[model samples]
Target chain A: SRREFVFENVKFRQLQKEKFQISNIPKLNDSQYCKPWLRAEPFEGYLEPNETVDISLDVYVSKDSVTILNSGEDKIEDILVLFLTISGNYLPSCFGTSLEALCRMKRPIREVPVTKLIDLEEDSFLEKEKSLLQMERPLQVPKEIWLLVDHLFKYACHQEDLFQTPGMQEELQQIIDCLDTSIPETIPGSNHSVAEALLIFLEALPEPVICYELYQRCLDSAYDPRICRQVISQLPRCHRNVFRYLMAFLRELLKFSEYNSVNANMIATLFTSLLLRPPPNLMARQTPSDRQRAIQFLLGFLLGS
Target chain B: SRREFVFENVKFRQLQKEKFQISNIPKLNDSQYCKPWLRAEPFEGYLEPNETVDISLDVYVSKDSVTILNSGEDKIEDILVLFLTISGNYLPSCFGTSLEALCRMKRPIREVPVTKLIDLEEDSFLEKEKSLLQMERPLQVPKEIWLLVDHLFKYACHQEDLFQTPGMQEELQQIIDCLDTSIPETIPGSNHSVAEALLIFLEALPEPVICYELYQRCLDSAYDPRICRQVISQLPRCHRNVFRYLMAFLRELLKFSEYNSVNANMIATLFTSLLLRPPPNLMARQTPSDRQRAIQFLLGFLLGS
Candidate 1:
């Protein structure tokens, strides 16, 4: 109800390499609401008297934007004609100060949420450039991950009750948190703690190695090992490669299972929900029992000799 | 641009069988536009003076609309406190009459666009419920389809050069269009004409038996019979059954390929894009050669024992 189009039309011609200027500030019923300009890419802004702003309304024509004689006006081109909004802030006395301050607020942001990840510092048998931000899980497993796994081999490999023995909750969590932001030298932890941290890192993968779309497909095809292998092969290259690397490690782990007191059944049960889980919301609507049976069938295939 | 709110707020209470009335039509400037009522459902409505209408904002609490008292206001409940719009329609003198008449107009209608469908009349080995309008296709594969297929067996099945012997384009189109709305008793046509009709019906299946989502999945898993069979098994029930029915008929037709001159390559070439193709927009961006190899792989498996 507070929104109104103070101006009927604002047309910006000379579409590109040009700017549109708003020199005169329109009168506001409540002059206190100084941040009167709304949505010039933001909800509001303020301009002092006699001050003006010129905006680029820049239209970036991508590689495929222009095409054959089949000409339909471009979407960005249509945006040249815009309906401008000038709204009264719903606040009162302090409204003018708070709303303007809020409008002028600056938020420091990073490349993306995933930029928080610590990736490989150098190359060694690496696939093309690894872009950590590209997917739910890093396309290439982080070097730190392999380093942590390295710690596992030296300290935890064939260590009795690895993964079978639960790690101390708090200490295990401390290492997981420590690993989240950066890697520590030697990965300070007992065999159980290190193995548990390994699982935690994998379980926390934004998308499992099988990839979300292929989850149901993999499960549905789990009746036959041949079919399951076919489905897994369809995973995007990075995901497939990562899954293969993890499987290679697991295979090695399996060889020493007798000494470690870990077995195929234990590994399958532990990793079933970790890797095969449907996304959060899907779990509620999805058939849990069916997922359970299919997951077991699939995990059994992977853990097979 | 000429729109402005005459009323800042519009609230409806009781949230049930009771109705909220707009006793005094909020004065819409430029009184010519008699259709002052906007979006109590339909965008505009006309109300004569002294005729105040009561609206039943009857919140239909469906089986699940009410929940665990989660404290979050219900969406429909949020509708109770809606911001109302009362503004001038941009029309002038005759604007009043035209807008009012347009607002008062009634559209003659049917259940849905697809309600224009012919379904089976009685019981057969039909699945539970036959709702023709359910999918991009008639899930049951319309009885008329079976009738058309029946004609194929009688006349077109082993006809020399069937499918390879192209039917007259005009006559083929005529049969195709005729079958679209209703099936003919005799399916009046030559063997080639009938065979062409069968392909047309299969090609026009809104989503092929492979289904849109599975088009890529099927293509990817086309490498081995064991793998392909698993993917095919995951198709929705009706699509799977329909594909099987077509394959069975094709297998019979293949038996006489030497006599009919419709070899596997001919069949594959004709039906490749028909059943294995992606939806329209995807075709341009999708890799055609890759699709070619994969589709051949998939179709060959289906044509195999």
Candidate 2:
């Protein structure tokens, strides 16, 4: 039943298109086959030395996925495919040729999940990384999988160069609508359903770091958001401490990141849009403080990773 | 002329045998000598892995090569050779093994200063050993040299096990009488000889580590009995910071090591014996508060050292 439910989906096709929109989709010599695809790039690789910038980002879309849409006040279901990309970048020169992971979403989900990528420069950081990766084995989702997805969706719709792709505009609109509906006002209480829905919506997005940060903000909000526990529990069960780091990252982000009262309500809206479509805020230029805080928060996260 | 004046009619043979009464005479094998004969042991190499403790000290006997002695109260002559050892120690050690240097003065002035024979496992501390050795390098005659030598002589006498050597008693007595007359009744503002002598004396002793605990005692004599720059200037020409550390150490030491008024006066008398051999006072231990004040004074001394 689960296989049929997964296979009969039209969402995968949309996801493939979304991936193509954000990244350079490598052409297949034989394009007629309907086989599912996987990224050809190898994990744990670095940017080419000849590249002008030592670090660069690449995006890809997953084929076939479900798209939940918001029509007017109520949302309509639309089949959309989810795509993914593995974003990578080299850290500063001091860290050697090793790159740090900084993936962004393509069009819809632009949340950057505060995830630990690598800490190659530190003497003991590799051991920590190895342990974290080892713990990620049992979980069906890769350790940083949610974060990658969330950021990819976000980057797809927000990046001007990528946003120009066909259907990205409407996709962004639909995602915004979905996120708006998920805000506390639209759904109330401490029940697991709210937490579950929130988690699912977060997973559907492209960037997990933002999800992680948002999850933290929610927990600290007056509403006493329990979604952190829900999402954290679902994270591919890795070392409990790594999960703890994720929670801590969220707390730190909340402490340092400036959140306007007006902007608070839009978080759910943004997240939902990232799931159903692409996020409009993805293209907005980040403020200097925001960029700094993001980098600092991300760096601490990676060191712990 | 120098050798002739020193040995006049006293028979160079007998003076050499009786004055600097070193116990055992070892040859050019300097390394084979125990510790006392070596004047000061090399103690800088050993350091505890987890603690930041350093031991260093220096002492200089008067290098003028002239022997002056007092006969009764009004007359003076040169008959006995003067021998002194200035000693110092830092944290976790008591007792200085400088007896060999003083007792062995009967040997040629150029012979190794001390016998270096005695070794007491319990009292011999590495830090103290190192500090005592450091006391030898910065030597200037008739200056800080007096204080360092005086302290070592008295400390040796008090430490029964180390002081039972050859002509030490008569030598100490002659030095005491000389020092007593050296202090002028009316300290002419211009002539700082007496103050210099006292400063040299204080510099020779261990300093405390606190500052505010040294100023409680009321001196009946009409002199400002408090720490001052003139006193600090009397310290050796080694690292300038040693004076600071000395003042600080004196302040801290006074906080804990103060005795009753009688004992305090006794300490003062003991202090005088080593430098001026002043008349004894009836007071023994200081009051608790006075004890606190003494600590403050010692700390001030440490600051200058």
Candidate 3:
């Protein structure tokens, strides 16, 4: 069979060279000649039984030769010859068939004209991979949830032995699970872990939820503790549920103080403005009477703490 | 005198090393020890007689040693030693003095305490050279002059045997001289020639004077002759002298067509918009009646051409 294939390949090369008078020809005996030319589907991991694989061959010819074929005077059809080889190990045993019936299949050499070849637009493999990866769910969290998480981290810093308690440990586990579920599967070999994703999510929140403006005002008045307190007093009240969630999260964070190594003074300085000042959006949403009650509750809480 | 100078330098280095405990020191016999440390004035070409040249020595010392000297317990005063050498090739002849007294002079080892050594801020040599060059007349041409030169070149292109005339030859020389004078002396070794300077000057002209907006409009309309005429028809009148000067300069440029290798069509394409469009500022400065007359004259000129 190998001798027949080699004889057929030599005949094909002689026919191509004599007919075209082409230079810089690719070697006939080269393995590249046998490489599958067209792939119907991308190479994915191991194939399963009954799965279909579609493959095709590609023939290359000079552009000048193509033009010559298109010209009116030389209106002759060109023929291309191909020889294919298929190898399978233990195929008859796997398929429960005779080797002669399955492996000894044959077809006559098919002829294709140069005119039938169509130009295919260039495609980017990287772009295709990017689109495939984007099929996963996006990592996103609600603004209210972000605000609660930020506040909870600070509140936990002040609480003693908060994470050690059974109830707090359960709550912490639930928070971790929520974050894990929200995070998308990162690209293969990427170091974008769940903890990093959560930190990035917190960092991306808008200034209102983070209380950045109030923090800056407190920082400017940091030289005078009384002035800092005055700045904190101007903070607006947030939703009751949001305030509660933030405090709970802060208490939870304090439990992991040994691991985080965050000092109490540092936590107090960062969260004072956030805890005292309500988000502008929250302030705008509340009624005048409700706003006053929220502020009063926050003022008492601050004084007691 | 030279031997005494060499002896002093050796003594200075020996005193400096023992006092400071510096290592890997440059040899006192090295020619660099005799080289001037600081130049107060730039080395201008062809010095005049009696002109004073002041140069000084730079003392190398370790920062750590300076700190040690400054520390209170080491309160011992640190004295720096220096040896001076003076050279004179022309001094004896120029100053009308004996070579022994004027050409050869030497200074002994001089001692100065660290307290007296003041730090002089660094000055850029290029900046100093630039200021000296600026003392010469700047090469600036008015917008009117530039427009006149552009137009005259185009006009000269159409005239047969114009550049051969004695009158035109003189005018062309004047134009070259004017351009040559305007171009600043480029930095040493730079390829920024007179041609580049002229192009930069044209590019830097104020918008109204260059009429870039109208020029672009003309360029877009160039394919359609009728549209080009319409755009030209709307052009306002510039200063009478500016229009006249442009025509003269254009005529001058046409004389050098053989040498410049610029065709009449190329010149016409480049200068048509510039000639027809009155600088916006020029139009603003003119009276209503004068502006109308100028426009009429420009219309006749464009159509006639």
Candidate 4:
């Protein structure tokens, strides 16, 4: 199964590469595209550099040292990062340059085009798990995948505690009951507990291990069918960038799973379930960042879903 | 009444001028002072040649002509512009050597020791207005005595709306109401409304007015009095440089107030009242240029108190 999945992914990646002519912009990849955006020069005076020049003429000319690279990065996470970078650029244009421009860039990654694959897969998984096996998606989900889910659930619980979002604590506890683990440790670097690591990863971005940890938390927490649905429904409606990131992360995890019994398809399926499944009664938050994060969590869940 | 106040002010002015040996540096009159402060310098450096020389003999002097004035041509509302011009020479010796140091000169009029008069007069007046008027002392108030107080009150009002600190709004309003309407508009051929003009003036400062506006809103909505107290307590504690600016402004105002239906003494008395009257229960919200303006506001408030 591992060999067949790997073969299929390799083909899928090659096809994707052919479809999108990706470019490598090293500075953007490392700094996550912040450098170029911040590289605006101060307005020169009328006396100096007075001649008006077209931006395209300046940027495209070799003498001007402008380099245009494909927005696509090598890793899926990098793609997600690029997506976010592009969206950030577009945010100002959309918001009439309001102060809330940065906030607008933050939204569910599921809303992006990249996560459509996960959404399609999760819907089928939900139907098959519910009726054919008379079990929920969470019940059918593997122990390792469950660990990632549980990590995310715990994070939601902490957020609930800090922000005191209603019912999040109780819901998180119920998910914890299904998760086979002791309480997540608070001390940093002492334990890479699945949920703890994921929480840390989500809190601190561009960290794959951290993202993986969050994925574990999501799996652990989404035990009951009702809970799975609830968690999935809360998944961000738009998170193209995060989805790209998750896809890349899953590919890496798939390789790790070869020696350690990691199920790439199951992880992928779980995340997909999370995308399609709806939470019981959690009202959608107005904050775009919150929504984006929730979707990112779901993407992580589906990686093992 | 204007003539009488002018005559009385002349007596005090004569007495104050007699106390100091007037420097050979042609002491510009208030109007003359304003012109120089507003006049855009052909070059960028803030400290004058002498001021720069005072810092260090080998200080780098740029040939690039940067104007003392800000970007706007119609008006020069930059606080730095006004501040440097007014207090550059009189600034404490510390500023001479330290690049980050602020001017600590609190001698309002170059010709008069206005700080002493403001301290003595305000202390006595507060004794009459409020029984519990206890101010931190050894205070050196700013000059243009009446005008400085008026501007400070304006700032206080704007900030009060932002911070909603206890009694701040009423105190500022009282000062505004009590000010002499007959005070002559100094700038020739300019008809900008004084209140509107002041707002513009503040907006141009390194600290923006939006900060004050926001602070006022915060004060209005604050759930606890402790918040107001915490904010109010931040009023200028030890920044003597800002106090000097305040004193300089006050002296100029006092000089100008004498040429009005209201006497400089009455304006001075009002100025003292503002200091004595404790700020209100709630503070105004933070404005656009909140961080910087707040610091300056606190400094002035401390001196007034």
Candidate 5:
């Protein structure tokens, strides 16, 4: 019964097909406290030099092989992490035809503290927080997220009633979907789609441009640019810059509102919901009308009042 | 002239085509290793967005304008490592567009413990030594090390002569050259490359597998496998497994040489100086014959008398 969940997960493509000779495998049970090492059974033998053998890692799911898939996200990741470390060592183990290089090895890259493959690679990146000005120089908001942001900017600035006109969705989704492969410098879509893609992408983000957790803090200082500046400074730099990047575009847009008919309230109304909201659980008690004032106050100041 | 080793190799692509920023330039008047650290000035500045701006980094050297390229091996990697960290932090730094992320991050990945660039990535990796056993399952036999071991044996056992035949020097050095590369499966060099590489790497190890300090203990236990394994068991698990690893290879080699011709005595004579020396101080009083017996005795125990 417990094996179903595990058997499904332990498959090809996870461990790059590395034929390794291992003299032994670690004891197991997927529990962290137990460190229950996985079994690479039938490992204690000669892996002939010419032949590539697959060492099926047999895991003894002592208990929550059931609950494992329950937390699912973490257990799955940890499972994959352990697999990487296992294969990482396996590929290097043939000198003198001894599995010694792999059968058992040192404990790094392996125990990335619970095999945090996601934890280590993703947000785990770091060094100094300031001064490596080469690539770290501020505000490329142009490249990654802003790939199309600038294009959208001039496109809208080139048109009148930009954000006010809504784009046709059947066409909007197509344009937006194409943007995924590579953002183009210019587009044929209506200005509404351009304006909406900005809002659309921001809202649909797995994590928001301005993080959700910081929404309250941002809203608390929403009325003042100077105060909100403090919150922006503390955000994870990616979020901060994107937030600033978007803000700068809007700030520039604010200048255009003079002729384009879009105003701070207009930008705030369309963008605020995407930017500020209580985390889902708290949303039932929160209302757009209430945050409207705060969001409006913030945008107004951001656009330099 | 010391700088010649450096200036020669510190060419256009030496730093991975990366131009970096540094706050302080290490006075490069190269003595032995007074690494003052190099700074690519003009590095400190703002990189604007919506418009791509290239920031050029300036590196200043106080000396070694020549001869620095002489040693070539070390400083090259060290400099390259510093650039990687600098650029590593630079690319991720522009969300809010602040250079803060790049400006002075962590000591690691940056310092890389003297920017081994080679040491840490290639070999200087680990956590616990044995029990964790993925990184330390008995051994991955030294990640950077077993890299060639896997290839060597694959290619060596692919032969009839194995270690007995002398590999062409040109072919030998080429294999050695490939060893520094990230992967070895890409090349096929003579077994002598593997053999000489073994000898070459062991002699230079900052610390030997049977650590230099522990050489006496290993020698003390040389005559007895039971005691020797026990002594080995006590080594940093990495050393223990590696000792066990090489021992396994030697034992296995015995069977091969029975047909191929190299013997325990022969292997010992070649490797003794690398693995079985007293400290250089104690080595002064020791004779080749004395250590010869001990080295042979240890190999006898290691390969099983």
Candidate 6:
């Protein structure tokens, strides 16, 4: 004997203090008094009985009532009670049999196209290759190329052991090759390429013995004509083509003397080292006659005679 | 006899080796050479004989000749030779007696009006007075008014000897009177006058003892209610009207609580010393009972009971 109780105009009346009554001892299963306590199966609306539903109890008590209990000897406690009410239409058995029947029906599984799978695999491989390349090789021309040049000259000369180590030799050679390719080829009527190549070579040096140590030594004696001549005389003792290459580069650099405001004395000082001392790697490689010829060529070019 | 010979277009010629000559050294009797040289008394043209005249010589030289002489071992000397080449027209007796008679003619003397002299004297006196006032008086209301208040309170309490000195007392009184005049009178429907007066008194304190000292001490004890009360109780031992004025000022300040975001606690901390204690001068004058009553009234006002 199930009956549907619809509470469209529910009103709550506060019981008088003296006449407050709890009929049937307010048992958990008192259906008549429990009508308001019970909730619909789908609390929002009984959209579908088996679907997820939230059941919450919202009780409204006056502030005075809460205060009274708070001040009274019988302490007010926080208690959560849950009540679930289901319409006869949403009985467990009603959805249970129909839910089983719906579960019994099966649908065919779909497969992706083979060409699409291959394309996705190829794209992923290409992306992996790009990331690998990015990790393995930094950009050829660093944005901080000048800073790299400065740092190389500042510290590379002091790290002589690093250059001497056989392990770094291969890397040094690779950087030199990389710089050679990176520097633009000299075009007809263009003097800039020679200067650019010189800067690139200086920046690319794994151990900057010539630009740093030799340059500093020459600079220290630059004011003394005797020492300047001695330094210039020693430059050809360096590796093959090093002296020739440096002289050509410095000559090209002097073409922009007016634009750079590079005075004769400053040019004379910078060139003294390149004309005098052989690079560390080439120090023992050149013969005496080779050195003499190198010095003569450098002096003639430097003097503009 | 006197005469002037000026070579306006004097020409210089360099001879072979070390020799140089003035080509147009004019002869005294040559009128053509003397035409440009003779400047009359008024300089426009010739006037009377025996009158003052100017004789000048102008010459041009080549750069090479000057350079050669500058570098020469002989070191050509700069010699100024004056040649008085006289003509018969410049004879002293020609106009000497007549010139003496012309000089004998006298001109009348001029005198400024007496009123003009008096007015000038008066104007100078007024200017002197304005300058004196500007030098003696500082510009209106220093920007350091608040800082002055802070310092006054901080050092005033400790500098009891300074307050006791008769010399400072007179100056302090003068400042207090000045502040009194500066403060705007309270008007109907206006609550700002009291606050303005309080700020004026703080700014006008000769040494800024009360406002600064009390504020800093109260701020130090703001977090502790007990210490705050103690500091407040000690505030009254300052100069006359210091405490009473501060209290009245604080009361007015509280009216702007909404605008300044100053709460009752903050005001209470700030005004504790003023309400609890009387200034040193006021302490000696007021009865103990009067102070007690004042404290009670201030406490009541501050607490808003």
lDDT on C-alpha atoms for all candidate structures:
0.48, 0.27, 0.32, 0.28, 0.46, 0.32
Question: Cα deviation of A75 in candidate 4 (Å)?
Answer: 44
What DockQ results for candidate 2? 0.01
lDDT per residue as tens, model 3, A1-305: 12111111211001111111111112236544332211112223345565544322222222122222222222222222244333211100101111122112211011111121112334677566666457721112232244234443434344443323223323332333332221111111111122232332233323333254563454444455455446555644332223344445544554567865544444444444334444554453435654443344333323334
Accuracy of chain B in candidate 2 (TM-score): 0.22
Interface Cα RMSD in Å, per prediction:
30.6, 37.3, 36.2, 35.3, 15.5, 47.2
Residues A33-128, candidate 4, lDDT per residue (tens digit)? 432212212212233344542211001111011112111232122221213221211100111111122123222111112121111234665575
Displacement of the residue A281 alpha carbon in candidate 1, Å: 82
> Which candidate gets the maximum DockQ versus the true structure?
5
| Ordering by lDDT | 1, 5, 6, 3, 4, 2
lDDT of 6: 0.32
Give per-residue CA lDDT, model 2, range A4-28, as digits (tens). 1121222221222121111112333
Positional deviation of residue B191's Cα in model 2 after best superposition, in angstroms = 33
DockQ of each: 0.00, 0.01, 0.00, 0.00, 0.02, 0.00
Q: Identify the candidate with maximal lDDT.
A: 1
B204: Cα error in model 2, Å? 13
Evaluated at residue A49, the lDDT of candidate 5 is: 56
The alpha-carbon lDDT assigned to residue A80 of candidate 3 equals 23
Consecutive 10-residue window with the lowest summed lDDT within model 2 chain B: B63-72
RMSD (CA, Å), candidate 5 to true, equals 20.7
TM-score of 3: 0.16
| Candidate no. 4 TM-score | 0.16
